[PDB]
Amino acid sequence: QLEASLDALLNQVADLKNSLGSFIYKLENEYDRLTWPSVLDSFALLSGQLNTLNKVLKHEKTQVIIPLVEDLMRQTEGRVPVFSHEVVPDKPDPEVEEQEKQLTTDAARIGADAAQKQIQSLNKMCSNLLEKISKEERESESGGLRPNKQTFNPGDTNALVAAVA
Amino acid sequence: QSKETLLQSYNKRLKDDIKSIMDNFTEIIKTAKIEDETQVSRATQGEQDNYEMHVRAANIVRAGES
Amino acid sequence: DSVRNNLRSALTEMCVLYDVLSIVRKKFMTLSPQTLQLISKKKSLAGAAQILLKGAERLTKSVAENQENKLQRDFNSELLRLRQHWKLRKVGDKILGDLSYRS
Amino acid sequence: NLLGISWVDSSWIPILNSGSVLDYFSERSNPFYDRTCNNEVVKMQRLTLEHLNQMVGIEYILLHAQEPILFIIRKQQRQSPAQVIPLADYYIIAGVIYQAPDLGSVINSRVLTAVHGIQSAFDEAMSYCRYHPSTVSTKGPPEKRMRLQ
């Protein structure tokens, strides 16, 4: 059941990592060029892959992992379950610890009824208003059919041109 | 080499880039999601998606300006 | 570089996760008002808006400088002046048509 | 929590065999299970797997037994028989207490690490330098013929 979604997420993460590594190795040169040759494209690809992985993980399930009992055969070669059993536990998270501490300090820095809950509600209301305004603007701008210019009309004057008559 | 067709292609590319920049701006404005929808892993996945969307919107704005 | 090291660490973490998932695809089993998303939305919004405003201010300053001092405007400005003061330019790559008196 | 660690008792649990499984479960290193589980209740009179399933409590069962290298344990957490929910972490994988944690936490940690690294890389490579808006008469054939000689 969930194995399908697990394999899908694993393939997505592997493709993202492979694309990132290929872009890095192709544009390393021991130093990056300050002209954005492909940095924007790599950033867009990474952001899209991350958003796709997050949406797949949050959509639905379309735990515990014991030792080993052919992508995985290349890494876990020779049928070594001890490697998978020892690499599964191996996070310090030094900056994440400070972030969690600063968050759990107050999480709103002021007020109780006007805390992160009411702030998020007001932000969602403002975002809904902005999205409605943007949708109205897009529906208004979608009316543009084509830049219908105008020029001479030689089709009539040709037959209407002078002659022996 | 096809000066008129080259100018038409340049105009089409400029219009497509402008439309893509506008669509990226609209998507970044609509993907705010102030509601705490991240329930599986909030502190990790929420911040990850937020930073990714911010970097993507900044890159899209810079590319559109250029 | 630091960017290269960060990319390598991210790729290693993703590869480890993919290998663990592929192994699980061996033997698997089943085993606070922080408001993370609410604060992360505003944080990412401010972070993106900072860079956006920086780029917009840089572009506006460059445009105002190019419009103020009309002496370093080599891109198409000195070109328009020269063309109004000199011969035609058959645009094959950048310029052509010297004072060959072919007029 | 203790899933991130991979400690193992050296003097307490000298082995990870069938008989040593009870010693490893009764001696946490560092954490193995809660004190209010059914392991301490079964260890009152005599340690056995029958009394653990009979008494309603979090029992210490084995998921996969193998004396050779590793022995997957199954720390059941259920007050009813015919059910084994793994909650604690007292495995005998490679003669040591394994993590047996949920993959969601590790996946979220890896994703957050990758996102932070990518954001730092972008912020670093953003500003590096300035990227603002602002033969015909060569008759060498004679030389070639002379060099040919």
Coordinates of C-alpha atoms in Angstrom, one line a residue:
Chain A
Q1 CA 0.0 0.0 0.0
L2 CA 2.3 2.8 1.3
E3 CA 5.2 1.1 -0.5
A4 CA 4.1 2.7 -3.8
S5 CA 4.2 6.3 -2.3
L6 CA 7.4 5.5 -0.5
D7 CA 9.1 4.4 -3.8
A8 CA 7.7 7.4 -5.5
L9 CA 9.1 9.8 -2.9
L10 CA 12.4 7.9 -3.0
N11 CA 12.7 8.2 -6.8
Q12 CA 11.8 11.9 -6.6
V13 CA 14.4 12.6 -4.0
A14 CA 17.0 10.6 -5.9
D15 CA 16.3 12.4 -9.1
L16 CA 16.5 15.8 -7.3
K17 CA 19.8 14.8 -5.7
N18 CA 21.2 13.5 -9.1
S19 CA 20.2 16.7 -10.9
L20 CA 21.8 18.8 -8.2
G21 CA 25.0 16.8 -8.2
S22 CA 25.2 16.9 -12.0
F23 CA 24.7 20.6 -12.1
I24 CA 27.3 21.1 -9.4
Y25 CA 29.9 18.9 -11.1
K26 CA 29.2 20.6 -14.5
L27 CA 29.4 24.1 -13.0
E28 CA 32.0 23.7 -10.3
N29 CA 35.3 24.7 -11.9
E30 CA 36.6 25.2 -8.3
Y31 CA 34.5 28.5 -8.3
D32 CA 31.1 29.6 -9.5
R33 CA 30.7 32.3 -12.1
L34 CA 28.9 35.5 -11.1
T35 CA 26.6 35.8 -14.1
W36 CA 23.9 33.2 -13.3
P37 CA 24.7 30.7 -16.2
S38 CA 22.5 28.0 -14.8
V39 CA 22.1 28.9 -11.1
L40 CA 18.5 30.2 -11.6
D41 CA 17.6 27.0 -13.5
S42 CA 19.2 24.8 -10.8
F43 CA 17.4 26.7 -8.0
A44 CA 14.1 26.4 -9.9
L45 CA 14.5 22.7 -10.4
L46 CA 15.5 22.1 -6.8
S47 CA 12.5 24.2 -5.5
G48 CA 10.1 22.4 -7.8
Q49 CA 11.4 19.0 -6.7
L50 CA 11.1 20.0 -3.1
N51 CA 7.6 21.2 -3.6
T52 CA 6.6 18.0 -5.4
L53 CA 8.1 15.9 -2.7
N54 CA 6.2 17.9 0.0
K55 CA 2.9 17.6 -1.9
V56 CA 3.4 13.9 -2.4
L57 CA 4.2 13.4 1.3
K58 CA 1.2 15.6 2.3
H59 CA -1.4 14.3 -0.2
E60 CA -2.0 10.8 1.2
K61 CA -0.2 7.5 1.9
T62 CA -0.6 6.1 -1.7
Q63 CA 7.1 3.0 11.1
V64 CA 10.1 0.7 11.5
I65 CA 12.8 -0.6 9.2
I66 CA 14.6 -3.8 10.2
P67 CA 18.0 -4.9 8.6
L68 CA 18.4 -6.4 5.1
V69 CA 16.5 -9.6 4.7
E70 CA 18.6 -3.1 -8.1
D71 CA 19.4 0.3 -6.7
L72 CA 19.6 -0.8 -3.1
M73 CA 21.8 -3.8 -4.1
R74 CA 24.4 -1.4 -5.4
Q75 CA 24.7 0.5 -2.1
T76 CA 24.0 -2.5 0.2
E77 CA 26.3 -4.8 -1.8
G78 CA 27.4 -8.2 -0.6
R79 CA 24.2 -8.7 1.4
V80 CA 25.4 -6.9 4.5
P81 CA 22.4 -6.2 6.8
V82 CA 24.7 -4.8 9.5
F83 CA 25.4 -1.8 7.3
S84 CA 21.7 -1.0 7.0
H85 CA 21.2 -1.6 10.7
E86 CA 24.0 0.8 11.7
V87 CA 23.3 3.5 9.1
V88 CA 19.6 3.7 9.9
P89 CA 20.1 5.4 13.3
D90 CA 22.7 7.8 12.0
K91 CA 20.8 14.1 13.8
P92 CA 22.8 16.7 15.8
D93 CA 20.9 19.7 14.4
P94 CA 22.9 22.5 16.1
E95 CA 21.1 25.4 14.4
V96 CA 17.8 23.6 14.5
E97 CA 18.2 23.4 18.3
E98 CA 18.6 27.1 18.6
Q99 CA 15.7 27.7 16.3
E100 CA 13.4 25.4 18.4
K101 CA 14.6 27.2 21.5
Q102 CA 13.8 30.7 20.1
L103 CA 10.4 29.4 18.9
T104 CA 9.5 27.7 22.2
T105 CA 10.6 30.8 24.1
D106 CA 7.3 32.7 23.4
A107 CA 6.3 31.8 19.8
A108 CA 4.5 35.2 19.6
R109 CA 6.6 37.6 21.7
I110 CA 3.4 39.4 22.7
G111 CA -0.3 38.8 23.7
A112 CA -2.4 35.7 24.1
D113 CA -5.5 36.2 22.0
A114 CA -3.4 38.0 19.5
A115 CA -0.8 35.3 19.4
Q116 CA 0.4 33.3 16.4
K117 CA -3.1 31.9 15.9
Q118 CA -4.7 35.3 15.3
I119 CA -1.7 36.5 13.4
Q120 CA -1.9 33.5 11.1
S121 CA -5.7 34.0 10.7
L122 CA -5.2 37.7 9.7
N123 CA -2.4 36.7 7.4
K124 CA -4.6 34.1 5.7
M125 CA -7.4 36.7 5.4
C126 CA -5.0 39.1 3.7
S127 CA -3.7 36.4 1.5
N128 CA -7.2 35.4 0.4
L129 CA -8.0 39.0 -0.4
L130 CA -4.8 39.4 -2.4
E131 CA -5.5 36.1 -4.2
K132 CA -9.1 37.3 -5.1
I133 CA -7.7 40.6 -6.4
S134 CA -5.1 38.7 -8.5
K135 CA -7.7 36.4 -9.9
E136 CA -10.0 39.3 -10.8
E137 CA -7.0 41.0 -12.5
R138 CA -6.2 37.8 -14.4
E139 CA -9.8 37.3 -15.5
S140 CA -9.9 41.0 -16.6
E141 CA -6.6 40.7 -18.6
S142 CA -7.6 37.4 -20.2
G143 CA -10.1 39.2 -22.4
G144 CA -7.3 40.3 -24.7
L145 CA -7.8 38.4 -27.9
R146 CA -4.9 39.6 -30.2
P147 CA -3.1 42.8 -31.1
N148 CA -5.2 43.6 -34.1
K149 CA -3.3 46.3 -36.0
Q150 CA -4.4 48.0 -39.2
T151 CA -2.7 48.8 -42.5
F152 CA -3.5 49.6 -46.1
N153 CA -6.2 47.8 -48.1
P154 CA -4.6 46.9 -51.5
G155 CA -7.1 44.1 -52.1
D156 CA -9.8 46.6 -53.2
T157 CA -7.7 49.2 -54.9
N158 CA -5.9 46.6 -57.0
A159 CA -9.1 45.7 -58.9
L160 CA -10.1 49.3 -58.6
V161 CA -6.8 50.5 -60.1
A162 CA -6.8 52.5 -63.3
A163 CA -6.8 50.8 -66.7
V164 CA -7.6 51.6 -70.3
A165 CA -11.1 52.5 -69.1
Chain B
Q1 CA 18.5 35.6 -41.5
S2 CA 14.7 36.3 -41.4
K3 CA 14.9 39.7 -39.8
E4 CA 11.1 39.9 -39.5
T5 CA 10.8 36.4 -38.2
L6 CA 13.7 37.1 -35.8
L7 CA 11.9 40.2 -34.5
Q8 CA 8.7 38.2 -34.1
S9 CA 10.5 35.5 -32.2
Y10 CA 12.1 38.1 -29.9
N11 CA 8.7 39.7 -29.3
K12 CA 7.2 36.3 -28.5
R13 CA 10.0 35.4 -26.1
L14 CA 9.7 38.8 -24.3
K15 CA 5.9 38.4 -24.0
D16 CA 6.2 34.8 -22.8
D17 CA 8.8 35.8 -20.2
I18 CA 6.6 38.6 -19.0
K19 CA 3.6 36.3 -18.7
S20 CA 5.8 33.7 -16.9
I21 CA 7.0 36.4 -14.4
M22 CA 3.4 37.5 -13.8
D23 CA 2.3 33.9 -13.3
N24 CA 5.2 33.3 -10.9
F25 CA 4.3 36.4 -8.9
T26 CA 0.6 35.4 -8.7
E27 CA 1.6 31.9 -7.6
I28 CA 3.9 33.2 -4.9
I29 CA 1.1 35.5 -3.7
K30 CA -1.4 32.7 -3.7
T31 CA 0.8 30.1 -2.1
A32 CA 1.1 32.0 1.2
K33 CA -0.9 29.4 3.2
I34 CA -0.8 31.1 6.6
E35 CA -2.9 28.2 8.0
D36 CA -0.8 25.6 9.7
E37 CA -1.5 22.8 7.2
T38 CA 1.8 21.0 7.9
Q39 CA 0.7 18.3 10.3
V40 CA 3.2 15.4 9.4
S41 CA 6.3 17.5 10.2
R42 CA 5.6 21.1 10.9
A43 CA 8.9 22.6 12.1
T44 CA 10.9 20.8 9.3
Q45 CA 8.7 20.6 6.2
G46 CA 6.9 23.9 6.7
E47 CA 10.2 25.8 7.0
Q48 CA 11.7 23.9 4.1
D49 CA 8.7 24.6 1.8
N50 CA 8.7 28.3 2.9
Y51 CA 12.4 28.8 2.2
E52 CA 12.1 27.0 -1.2
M53 CA 9.1 29.1 -2.2
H54 CA 10.9 32.3 -1.1
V55 CA 14.0 31.4 -3.1
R56 CA 11.9 30.5 -6.1
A57 CA 10.0 33.7 -6.0
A58 CA 13.2 35.8 -5.7
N59 CA 14.8 33.9 -8.6
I60 CA 11.6 34.4 -10.7
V61 CA 11.5 38.1 -9.9
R62 CA 15.2 38.5 -10.8
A63 CA 14.8 36.6 -14.0
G64 CA 11.7 38.6 -15.0
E65 CA 13.5 41.9 -14.3
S66 CA 16.5 40.8 -16.3
Chain C
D1 CA 33.1 26.1 -2.0
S2 CA 30.5 26.4 0.8
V3 CA 27.7 26.0 -1.8
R4 CA 29.4 22.9 -3.1
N5 CA 29.7 21.5 0.4
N6 CA 26.0 22.2 1.1
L7 CA 25.0 20.6 -2.2
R8 CA 27.1 17.5 -1.4
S9 CA 25.6 17.2 2.0
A10 CA 22.1 17.5 0.7
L11 CA 22.8 14.9 -2.0
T12 CA 24.3 12.5 0.5
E13 CA 21.3 12.9 2.8
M14 CA 18.9 12.3 -0.1
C15 CA 20.9 9.3 -1.3
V16 CA 20.9 7.8 2.2
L17 CA 17.1 8.4 2.4
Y18 CA 16.5 6.8 -1.0
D19 CA 18.7 3.8 -0.1
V20 CA 16.8 3.3 3.1
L21 CA 13.5 3.5 1.3
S22 CA 14.6 1.1 -1.4
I23 CA 15.7 -1.4 1.3
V24 CA 12.3 -0.9 3.0
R25 CA 10.7 -1.3 -0.5
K26 CA 13.8 -6.1 3.1
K27 CA 11.7 -6.0 6.3
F28 CA 9.5 -3.1 7.4
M29 CA 7.3 -2.6 10.4
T30 CA 5.1 0.0 12.1
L31 CA 6.5 1.9 15.1
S32 CA 2.7 23.2 22.0
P33 CA 1.6 26.5 20.4
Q34 CA 4.7 26.8 18.2
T35 CA 2.8 27.4 15.0
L36 CA 5.7 26.4 12.8
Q37 CA 3.9 27.1 9.5
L38 CA 2.5 30.4 10.7
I39 CA 5.9 31.8 11.6
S40 CA 7.7 30.2 8.6
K41 CA 5.3 31.9 6.1
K42 CA 6.1 35.3 7.5
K43 CA 9.8 34.5 7.7
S44 CA 10.0 33.3 4.0
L45 CA 7.9 36.3 3.0
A46 CA 10.3 38.8 4.6
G47 CA 13.3 36.9 3.3
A48 CA 12.0 37.0 -0.3
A49 CA 10.8 40.6 0.0
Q50 CA 14.3 41.7 1.2
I51 CA 16.0 40.4 -1.9
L52 CA 13.1 41.7 -4.1
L53 CA 13.4 45.2 -2.7
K54 CA 17.2 45.1 -3.0
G55 CA 17.1 44.1 -6.7
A56 CA 14.3 46.7 -7.4
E57 CA 16.3 49.5 -5.7
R58 CA 19.5 48.5 -7.6
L59 CA 17.7 48.5 -10.9
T60 CA 16.0 51.9 -10.1
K61 CA 19.4 53.4 -9.0
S62 CA 21.1 52.1 -12.2
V63 CA 18.3 53.5 -14.4
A64 CA 18.4 56.9 -12.6
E65 CA 22.1 57.0 -13.0
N66 CA 21.9 56.2 -16.7
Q67 CA 19.2 58.8 -17.2
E68 CA 21.0 61.5 -15.2
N69 CA 24.5 61.5 -16.7
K70 CA 23.9 61.2 -20.5
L71 CA 27.6 60.6 -21.2
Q72 CA 28.2 57.0 -20.3
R73 CA 25.0 55.8 -22.1
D74 CA 26.9 53.8 -24.7
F75 CA 24.0 51.3 -25.2
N76 CA 22.0 52.7 -28.1
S77 CA 22.2 56.3 -27.0
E78 CA 25.6 57.2 -28.3
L79 CA 24.6 54.9 -31.1
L80 CA 21.5 56.9 -32.0
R81 CA 23.7 60.1 -31.8
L82 CA 26.3 58.5 -34.1
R83 CA 23.8 57.3 -36.6
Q84 CA 22.2 60.7 -36.7
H85 CA 25.7 62.1 -37.3
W86 CA 27.2 59.3 -39.5
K87 CA 26.4 56.7 -42.2
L88 CA 24.0 53.7 -42.2
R89 CA 24.6 50.5 -40.3
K90 CA 23.7 47.2 -42.1
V91 CA 23.1 45.1 -38.9
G92 CA 24.7 41.8 -39.8
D93 CA 26.2 41.3 -36.4
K94 CA 26.8 44.8 -34.8
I95 CA 27.7 47.4 -37.4
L96 CA 28.8 48.0 -41.0
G97 CA 28.8 50.5 -43.8
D98 CA 31.8 52.8 -43.4
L99 CA 32.5 56.0 -45.4
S100 CA 32.9 54.1 -48.6
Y101 CA 31.1 56.9 -50.6
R102 CA 28.8 54.2 -52.0
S103 CA 26.0 56.7 -51.4
Chain D
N1 CA 14.3 10.0 23.3
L2 CA 17.1 7.6 22.5
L3 CA 16.5 6.6 18.8
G4 CA 19.3 8.8 17.6
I5 CA 21.8 7.0 19.9
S6 CA 23.0 3.4 19.3
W7 CA 24.4 2.5 22.7
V8 CA 24.7 -1.0 24.0
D9 CA 25.3 -2.5 27.5
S10 CA 28.8 -4.0 27.8
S11 CA 28.9 -5.4 31.3
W12 CA 25.1 -5.7 31.8
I13 CA 24.2 -7.4 28.5
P14 CA 27.3 -9.5 27.7
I15 CA 25.6 -11.2 24.8
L16 CA 22.5 -10.9 22.6
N17 CA 21.3 -14.5 22.7
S18 CA 17.9 -15.8 23.8
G19 CA 18.8 -15.9 27.5
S20 CA 20.7 -12.6 27.2
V21 CA 17.7 -11.0 25.6
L22 CA 16.0 -10.8 29.1
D23 CA 19.2 -9.2 30.6
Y24 CA 19.3 -6.7 27.7
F25 CA 15.6 -5.8 28.2
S26 CA 16.0 -5.5 32.0
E27 CA 19.2 -3.4 31.7
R28 CA 18.6 -0.3 29.5
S29 CA 21.6 1.2 27.7
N30 CA 21.0 4.0 27.6
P31 CA 17.2 3.9 27.3
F32 CA 15.5 0.7 26.3
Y33 CA 11.9 0.9 27.6
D34 CA 9.7 2.4 30.3
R35 CA 9.7 1.1 33.9
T36 CA 5.9 0.8 33.9
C37 CA 5.9 -1.7 31.0
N38 CA 5.1 -5.4 31.3
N39 CA 8.8 -6.4 31.3
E40 CA 9.2 -5.3 35.0
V41 CA 5.9 -7.0 35.9
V42 CA 7.1 -10.3 34.3
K43 CA 10.5 -9.9 35.9
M44 CA 8.9 -9.9 39.4
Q45 CA 8.6 -13.6 39.8
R46 CA 10.4 -15.1 36.8
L47 CA 11.2 -13.7 33.4
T48 CA 9.2 -15.5 30.6
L49 CA 7.4 -14.7 27.4
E50 CA 4.2 -16.4 28.5
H51 CA 3.5 -14.2 31.5
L52 CA 4.4 -11.1 29.4
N53 CA 1.5 -11.8 26.9
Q54 CA -0.8 -12.9 29.7
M55 CA -0.4 -9.7 31.8
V56 CA -1.9 -6.6 30.3
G57 CA 1.1 -4.3 29.6
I58 CA 3.9 -3.3 27.3
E59 CA 5.7 -6.6 26.8
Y60 CA 9.2 -7.3 25.4
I61 CA 8.8 -9.7 22.5
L62 CA 11.2 -10.6 19.7
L63 CA 10.4 -9.7 16.1
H64 CA 13.1 -11.9 14.5
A65 CA 15.4 -14.1 16.4
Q66 CA 18.9 -15.1 15.1
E67 CA 21.8 -16.0 17.3
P68 CA 24.4 -15.5 14.6
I69 CA 24.6 -11.7 14.2
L70 CA 21.4 -9.8 14.8
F71 CA 18.1 -10.4 16.5
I72 CA 15.1 -8.1 15.7
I73 CA 13.2 -7.5 18.9
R74 CA 9.5 -6.4 19.0
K75 CA 8.7 -4.3 22.1
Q76 CA 5.0 -4.9 22.1
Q77 CA 2.8 -2.1 23.6
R78 CA -0.7 -3.5 24.1
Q79 CA -2.9 -4.5 27.0
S80 CA -4.4 -7.4 25.0
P81 CA -3.0 -10.6 23.5
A82 CA -2.7 -11.4 19.8
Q83 CA -1.2 -7.9 19.2
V84 CA 2.3 -6.5 19.2
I85 CA 2.7 -2.7 18.7
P86 CA 6.4 -1.7 18.7
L87 CA 6.9 1.4 20.9
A88 CA 10.2 1.0 22.8
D89 CA 13.7 0.3 21.3
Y90 CA 15.4 -2.7 22.8
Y91 CA 16.5 -4.6 19.7
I92 CA 19.5 -6.9 19.5
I93 CA 20.6 -6.0 16.0
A94 CA 24.3 -6.8 15.6
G95 CA 24.5 -7.6 19.4
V96 CA 23.4 -4.0 20.2
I97 CA 20.3 -1.9 20.8
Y98 CA 19.0 -0.7 17.5
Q99 CA 17.1 2.5 16.9
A100 CA 13.9 1.1 15.4
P101 CA 12.5 4.6 14.9
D102 CA 9.9 6.1 12.5
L103 CA 11.1 7.0 9.0
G104 CA 9.1 10.2 9.0
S105 CA 11.3 11.9 11.5
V106 CA 14.5 11.0 9.6
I107 CA 13.0 12.0 6.3
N108 CA 11.9 15.4 7.7
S109 CA 15.3 16.0 9.2
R110 CA 17.0 15.2 5.9
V111 CA 14.6 17.4 4.0
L112 CA 15.2 20.3 6.4
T113 CA 18.9 19.9 6.2
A114 CA 18.8 19.8 2.4
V115 CA 16.6 22.9 2.3
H116 CA 18.9 24.8 4.7
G117 CA 21.9 23.9 2.6
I118 CA 20.2 24.9 -0.7
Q119 CA 19.1 28.2 0.9
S120 CA 22.6 28.9 2.2
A121 CA 24.1 28.1 -1.2
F122 CA 21.7 30.5 -3.0
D123 CA 22.3 33.3 -0.5
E124 CA 26.1 32.8 -0.9
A125 CA 26.2 32.5 -4.7
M126 CA 23.7 35.4 -5.1
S127 CA 26.1 38.3 -4.7
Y128 CA 29.6 37.5 -6.1
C129 CA 30.5 40.2 -8.6
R130 CA 29.0 42.9 -10.9
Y131 CA 26.1 41.7 -13.1
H132 CA 24.1 44.9 -13.2
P133 CA 22.3 46.2 -16.3
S134 CA 25.3 48.4 -17.3
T135 CA 44.2 36.9 -43.0
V136 CA 43.1 37.2 -46.7
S137 CA 46.7 38.0 -47.9
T138 CA 48.0 35.2 -45.6
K139 CA 49.8 33.2 -48.3
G140 CA 51.4 30.7 -46.0
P141 CA 51.3 28.0 -48.7
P142 CA 54.8 29.1 -49.8
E143 CA 56.0 28.8 -46.2
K144 CA 54.5 25.3 -46.0
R145 CA 56.1 24.2 -49.2
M146 CA 59.4 25.5 -48.0
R147 CA 59.1 23.7 -44.7
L148 CA 58.3 20.5 -46.6
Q149 CA 61.4 20.8 -48.8

